[PDB]
Amino acid sequence: EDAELLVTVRGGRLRGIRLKTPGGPVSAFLGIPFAEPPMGPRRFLPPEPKQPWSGVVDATTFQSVCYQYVDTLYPGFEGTEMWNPNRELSEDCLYLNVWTPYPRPTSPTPVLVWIYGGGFYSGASSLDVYDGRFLVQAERTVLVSMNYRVGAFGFLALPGSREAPGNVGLLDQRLALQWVQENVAAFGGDPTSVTLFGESAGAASVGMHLLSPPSRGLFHRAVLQSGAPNGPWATVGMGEARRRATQLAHLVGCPNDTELVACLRTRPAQVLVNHEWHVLPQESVFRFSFVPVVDGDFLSDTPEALINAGDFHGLQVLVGVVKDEGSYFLVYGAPGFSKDNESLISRAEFLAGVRVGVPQVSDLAAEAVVLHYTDWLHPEDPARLREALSDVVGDHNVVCPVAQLAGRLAAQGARVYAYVFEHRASTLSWPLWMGVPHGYEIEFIFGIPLDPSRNYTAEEKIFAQRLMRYWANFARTGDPNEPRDPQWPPYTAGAQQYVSLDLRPLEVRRGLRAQACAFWNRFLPKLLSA
Amino acid sequence: EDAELLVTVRGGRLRGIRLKTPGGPVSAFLGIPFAEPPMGPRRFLPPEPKQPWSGVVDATTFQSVCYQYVDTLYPGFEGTEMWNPNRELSEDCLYLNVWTPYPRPTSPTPVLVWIYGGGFYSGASSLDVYDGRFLVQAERTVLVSMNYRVGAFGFLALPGSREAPGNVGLLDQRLALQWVQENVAAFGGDPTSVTLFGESAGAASVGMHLLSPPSRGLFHRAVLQSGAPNGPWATVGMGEARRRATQLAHLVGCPPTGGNDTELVACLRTRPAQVLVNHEWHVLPQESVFRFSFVPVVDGDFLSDTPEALINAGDFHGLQVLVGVVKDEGSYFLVYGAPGFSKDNESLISRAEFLAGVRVGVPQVSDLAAEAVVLHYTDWLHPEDPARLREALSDVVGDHNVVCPVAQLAGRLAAQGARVYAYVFEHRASTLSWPLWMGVPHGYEIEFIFGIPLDPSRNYTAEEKIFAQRLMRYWANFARTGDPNEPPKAPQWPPYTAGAQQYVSLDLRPLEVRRGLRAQACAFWNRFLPKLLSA
Ligand SMILES: *[C@@H]1O[C@H](CO[C@@H]2O[C@@H](C)[C@@H](O)[C@@H](O)[C@@H]2O)[C@@H](O[C@@H]2O[C@H](CO)[C@@H](O)[C@H](O)[C@H]2NC(C)=O)[C@H](O)[C@H]1NC(C)=O
Ligand SMILES: *[C@@H]1O[C@H](CO[C@@H]2O[C@@H](C)[C@@H](O)[C@@H](O)[C@@H]2O)[C@@H](O[C@@H]2O[C@H](CO)[C@@H](O)[C@H](O)[C@H]2NC(C)=O)[C@H](O)[C@H]1NC(C)=O
Ligand SMILES: *[C@@H]1O[C@H](CO)[C@@H](O)[C@H](O)[C@H]1NC(C)=O
């Protein structure tokens, strides 16, 4: 029996598993229960701590994926399947994973905690692209990731009610962060040095823990990749949350909040999932039905407000985006688009596309978008129109919300580092016109290219090693820089400096799409208020 | 007596003068009366045709300048004095001028008719810079120019009333064009080949004659230099014209506000001209630049609808037009009221001064509209750089007032049947007396078009003389054929179209073809901003 793989945590004993890497072994504890299964009467309710067990929990394999929608746009295609569930679906899904060096560290090791994205409707900690073995071996951190409830199960809200208060998937994450405070030392991790990192909805999640005081005591630094809590898709108001929940009930045959939730609780999980997309108020891309709700509790105001009004002295944050944030989303509803052709759209398609990519705004607002994103010397050129709509969706949903978070944090006391990720993976299965799409830096951060069974180049492995070092340096010190030799400067509201991350050495540049982001962040809100 | 210098027109006999030019003699008939003097009881009324006379009228010097405000912002400064009156002020000012080759043409000769600018408040056909002798000598056309009433005298309007109907300055212009039709053949001119040209307010006037059916039959082609009838300074609605007229009357003791129109006008007619002029600027609703108190009014009569609407809804088949702008349309206007600006320093303004200038440069729009302007013209990587802010405020004023109205006029006309040629004038005269930062300001192409550098007493370079000759040639080719191009190996000037949007650069170098008259910027002013204003 290997003693390195035996651990006692507050709730009882665990058996883990030794994993291989090209750099040597790592210890892993996968599928640890952190909450009571949120089943039956507990559906829609806040999570309860896992009660103590006797005997030894088998922590040698990933546990079930939280019930969610499964993508069928391109069956069998790698580019979509890599994001789909790779274990069975269950509502009994509240488990977390810990990776540690081998043998177990004997002194406090800095902790990275990963929160997955997936638009709050999908995702899992067990996805191959989130495999912690390479980061832990190469940079000698402890790495934790958790499952949290998604879709209606995590985010359906009838505000005011106790039977479905909203934001429970966020509370699933908080409970996991509390579990880390209490138990990570048993693995050699340092509870006083916990860095949160997430991508997309995971990044929006990280930002929400930043702005919610009960969460803020549970971690020390933050990394937000391609997402922000102030993104227009990342939260919903109380009124619209109630409407969507109420329409879900009607669509699955249920009728008083208490009677409504009770009827929802009698329905098979899969049935809720089958109607999820239909509660959206219009045809759209980059919009998701059940998301965090602003109701005074977890978030006392909108994240925008909380950001504008907060003191952030003592915080260090690492934020960034990929080169083509919008491109992936266009094939899920923009007319004329497909991964399987050049998507060289017409002006009419571009115009219809703007209403899909910027849903629920006035005609005037849409006209303003068309003005800023048309080249009036080439109003009808297909390739330029394809690129412009990509920019519309990407700027609106990701780039400009991240830029505004970065600007306001830096101006209000925090030290911020910014990047743009510009390398297109040699193995990418999406067409060339999509460039570097949403989600495709993650495999480089996790060191996935070091896996011998995969097809990355020698240069790509060295690049992954550089990225792993930046991220871990940031976790350990609040600063991604290596010892002096080109330096990564802090981002500020005036100079607006960030770096390009690709196979070449760091290049320092200015402005996260400043001209476009002035539109989304400064002008457009004024227009919408009048 | 010299037979070349004697001419009979419908009204009676005229005697003219022989002018020397560097290239040979020209005949000139300066100061020909074309209306009865709009004196006393006739103030604010439409022009009456000049009654026939016995004997011989000496048309041998320019007549008086129509009553107007005189610029004193920089006393004695050449850059401003060149625009100031160079004859005594009088309400007795409705005279026109003809220049013709010597000896008189044997076969009918194409006619150019000049309409001066000056914001509908100023200007005169007598200014040295509008001296027609060089064009006539060089290109052998006939050149006509007329005086027309400006300010309250030409454009005060109490809409509906017979006693001050408004637009009488445009009627002065039209009467002169009717005079050219009836009489130009006596000077050797061809009434079937008449080309109007004008700059700033004169260009906007030309555009209005295009959009008014009774004017349209009096000419065949048109040239619009740095102005357009659809410019936001060029016309005013009925209610605002009434408000401005009523305030003027109030400020000069009439009536002893509003009331009977007949009574109010009769009281205004008792005021000395200068008294009205001294109160002119006080009727504007806010502090501004590029705004003028008394301008043409849209009342269904001269203009049946806004110039914008008339342009959008017109058939322009059969029309050739030449349009253009100078390189720095906005700069001249900034030293007349934008915070931080002077001709005598670098005008390196702050951000706060920029923001304040936007409201002066784009007056009487909502706070939201002003915010949209600041969005478009701010470089968000350099939001506070003084030199860039100076250049941006110049662009705001120039785009809004001149470039974009001209672009819009050119695009609609091209799309709706007209042949259109467009230019940007990029040469800064060696003799220019305004500071370097102002670049090529509003009004500084005119001296080249008129061939002023050929004047020996002035100190232009030889290259500038060559340049002037090229320009005069393009303008006259356009007047003769509807096409400025030379009837070989020289670079061709292509037509302007709504899609390709091609124009040429006019400077000391050969023609260079470019695309788009500030396309990105003008899409803001012409396409988006009006939707914001409606909503
Ligand atoms: C590129 O493809 C789009 C999307 O269409 C799908 O994928 C294609 C490879 C092909 O298999 C199509 O039949 C698929 O529908 C095309 O847009 C569609 O056009 C069809 C008619 O052919 C229409 O009925 C659909 O509604 C359209 N779908 C969308 C998403 O708008 C588009 O025509 C192709 N563009 C080209 C040829 O460049
Ligand atoms: C540049 O000039 C302007 C305008 O001022 C005129 O010209 C100057 C050369 C100098 O002779 C001034 O006295 C003239 O009035 C300056 O603007 C003014 O500042 C004063 C007080 O400092 C104020 O009373 C005026 O209103 C200002 N004029 C404005 C707002 O148009 C400007 O500051 C000068 N720039 C400099 C000094 O760099
Ligand atoms: C105004 O007064 C004059 C002068 O007596 C008179 O002739 C005219 O009809 C009056 N107008 C109106 C409409 O009262």
UniProtKB/Swiss-Prot annotation, chain A:
<keyword id="KW-0325">Glycoprotein</keyword>
<dbReference type="GO" id="GO:0042803">
    <property type="term" value="F:protein homodimerization activity"/>
</dbReference>
<feature type="binding site">
    <location>
        <position position="200"/>
    </location>
    <ligand>
        <name>huprine W</name>
    </ligand>
</feature>
<dbReference type="InterPro" id="IPR000997">
    <property type="entry name" value="Cholinesterase"/>
</dbReference>
<dbReference type="GO" id="GO:0007416">
    <property type="term" value="P:synapse assembly"/>
</dbReference>
<keyword id="KW-0449">Lipoprotein</keyword>
<feature type="binding site">
    <location>
        <position position="130"/>
    </location>
    <ligand>
        <name>huperzine A</name>
    </ligand>
</feature>
<dbReference type="GO" id="GO:0017171">
    <property type="term" value="F:serine hydrolase activity"/>
</dbReference>
<dbReference type="GO" id="GO:0016787">
    <property type="term" value="F:hydrolase activity"/>
</dbReference>
<comment type="subunit">
    <text>Interacts with PRIMA1. The interaction with PRIMA1 is required to anchor it to the basal lamina of cells and organize into tetramers. Isoform H generates GPI-anchored dimers; disulfide linked. Isoform T generates multiple structures, ranging from monomers and dimers to collagen-tailed and hydrophobic-tailed forms, in which catalytic tetramers are associated with anchoring proteins that attach them to the basal lamina or to cell membranes.</text>
</comment>
<keyword id="KW-0095">Blood group antigen</keyword>
<feature type="active site" description="Charge relay system">
    <location>
        <position position="325"/>
    </location>
</feature>
<protein>
    <recommendedName>
        <fullName>Acetylcholinesterase</fullName>
        <ecNumber>3.1.1.7</ecNumber>
    </recommendedName>
</protein>
<dbReference type="GO" id="GO:0005886">
    <property type="term" value="C:plasma membrane"/>
</dbReference>
<feature type="binding site">
    <location>
        <position position="119"/>
    </location>
    <ligand>
        <name>huprine W</name>
    </ligand>
</feature>
<dbReference type="GO" id="GO:0009986">
    <property type="term" value="C:cell surface"/>
</dbReference>
<dbReference type="GO" id="GO:0005615">
    <property type="term" value="C:extracellular space"/>
</dbReference>
<feature type="active site" description="Charge relay system">
    <location>
        <position position="438"/>
    </location>
</feature>
<feature type="binding site">
    <location>
        <position position="430"/>
    </location>
    <ligand>
        <name>huprine W</name>
    </ligand>
</feature>
<feature type="glycosylation site" description="N-linked (GlcNAc...) asparagine">
    <location>
        <position position="341"/>
    </location>
</feature>
<dbReference type="GO" id="GO:0042982">
    <property type="term" value="P:amyloid precursor protein metabolic process"/>
</dbReference>
<dbReference type="GO" id="GO:0120162">
    <property type="term" value="P:positive regulation of cold-induced thermogenesis"/>
</dbReference>
<dbReference type="InterPro" id="IPR029058">
    <property type="entry name" value="AB_hydrolase_fold"/>
</dbReference>
<dbReference type="InterPro" id="IPR014788">
    <property type="entry name" value="AChE_tetra"/>
</dbReference>
<comment type="function">
    <text>Hydrolyzes rapidly the acetylcholine neurotransmitter released into the synaptic cleft allowing to terminate the signal transduction at the neuromuscular junction. Role in neuronal apoptosis.</text>
</comment>
<dbReference type="GO" id="GO:0006581">
    <property type="term" value="P:acetylcholine catabolic process"/>
</dbReference>
<dbReference type="GO" id="GO:0005576">
    <property type="term" value="C:extracellular region"/>
</dbReference>
<feature type="active site" description="Acyl-ester intermediate">
    <location>
        <position position="200"/>
    </location>
</feature>
<dbReference type="GO" id="GO:0001540">
    <property type="term" value="F:amyloid-beta binding"/>
</dbReference>
<dbReference type="GO" id="GO:0005604">
    <property type="term" value="C:basement membrane"/>
</dbReference>
<dbReference type="GO" id="GO:0031594">
    <property type="term" value="C:neuromuscular junction"/>
</dbReference>
<dbReference type="GO" id="GO:0016020">
    <property type="term" value="C:membrane"/>
</dbReference>
<feature type="binding site">
    <location>
        <position position="83"/>
    </location>
    <ligand>
        <name>huperzine A</name>
    </ligand>
</feature>
<dbReference type="GO" id="GO:0005634">
    <property type="term" value="C:nucleus"/>
</dbReference>
<keyword id="KW-0770">Synapse</keyword>
<feature type="binding site">
    <location>
        <position position="83"/>
    </location>
    <ligand>
        <name>galanthamine</name>
    </ligand>
</feature>
<dbReference type="GO" id="GO:0007155">
    <property type="term" value="P:cell adhesion"/>
</dbReference>
<feature type="binding site">
    <location>
        <position position="438"/>
    </location>
    <ligand>
        <name>huprine W</name>
    </ligand>
</feature>
<dbReference type="GO" id="GO:0060041">
    <property type="term" value="P:retina development in camera-type eye"/>
</dbReference>
<dbReference type="GO" id="GO:0004104">
    <property type="term" value="F:cholinesterase activity"/>
</dbReference>
<dbReference type="GO" id="GO:0031623">
    <property type="term" value="P:receptor internalization"/>
</dbReference>
<keyword id="KW-0964">Secreted</keyword>
